[model samples]
Target: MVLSEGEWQLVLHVWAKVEADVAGHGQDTLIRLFKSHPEILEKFDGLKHLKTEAEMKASEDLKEHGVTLLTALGAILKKKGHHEAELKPLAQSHAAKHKIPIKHLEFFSEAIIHVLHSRHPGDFGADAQGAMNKALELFRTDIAAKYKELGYQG
Candidate 1:
């Protein structure tokens, strides 16, 4: 579950290229995610009214949410200790507050990789994809565990 320095380097090296456009990548990620699961929009505030993909893509609230989501992910990726320490609380809050499913995290993880590949095909090489897959898997399972800890059936 631990990311080796070399694996971290592979993921972070790609991240370095897009970190400058975090909002863009992040928003694209969410757009991709919501496109597949529009029902997830109800879980977020100020987003329930967006009935169309175009509406979601145009919303400032969505962009702000994307920024926050990626910023948190970036923080966890940069932190050296157990990611649970960071993801647990966030997961617990979602579990207790929104009763959000762990699968949503999984969905976001997939969407992020998809967006990365679509936006920067040359940079998202096989090695980086593998490294990112491992990292996001760690992230998804860590948060999912926390949601379970909170007794969230979802």
Candidate 2:
């Protein structure tokens, strides 16, 4: 199925969210979310797989960097903080490393949103927007904190 730029963005955003949640919250949360919204993964099979492969291949160095950042962020969170806040740097850095333009991120975000809407048409209302907003907030924050904590100024 051909997806518009907006549709693709929502899928990417959802993909990012799911990945972040899996990294931070564990597979259980990921499984639960998927179980509840199985259609989420049904939207685009090959595209998602290709995207995941590209992300993993492109971010080997960045992932290593991410580990360091996560460690620092974890320490801070242990003391008195939030994990999500520590991840923004990682997100921004990864985006830069992958040469992913802000426009691409928007496209990705929109695609994921479309997937969610398609999966559970009635699932996302005003409340869903708020939830997604918070999820994105945490995602960006966590990405930044991860990169910063790793000491990667770039």
Off by over 4 Å in 1: none
Model 1, position 76: C-alpha lDDT score: 87
**Which pairs clash in model 1?**
none
- Kindly list the per-residue Cα lDDT of model 1 for residues 7-60, writing each as its tens digit: 888888878776889888877888888888887777887877886778877999
For model 2, give the RMSD to the true fold.
13.1
Model 2 lowest lDDT segment of ten: 24-33
Name the lDDT of candidate 1: 0.81
The residue-level lDDT of candidate 2 at 1 comes to 17
Question: Whole-model lDDT, candidate 2?
Answer: 0.41
Clashes of each: 0, 35
Task: Work out the TM-score per prediction.
Answer: 0.90, 0.35
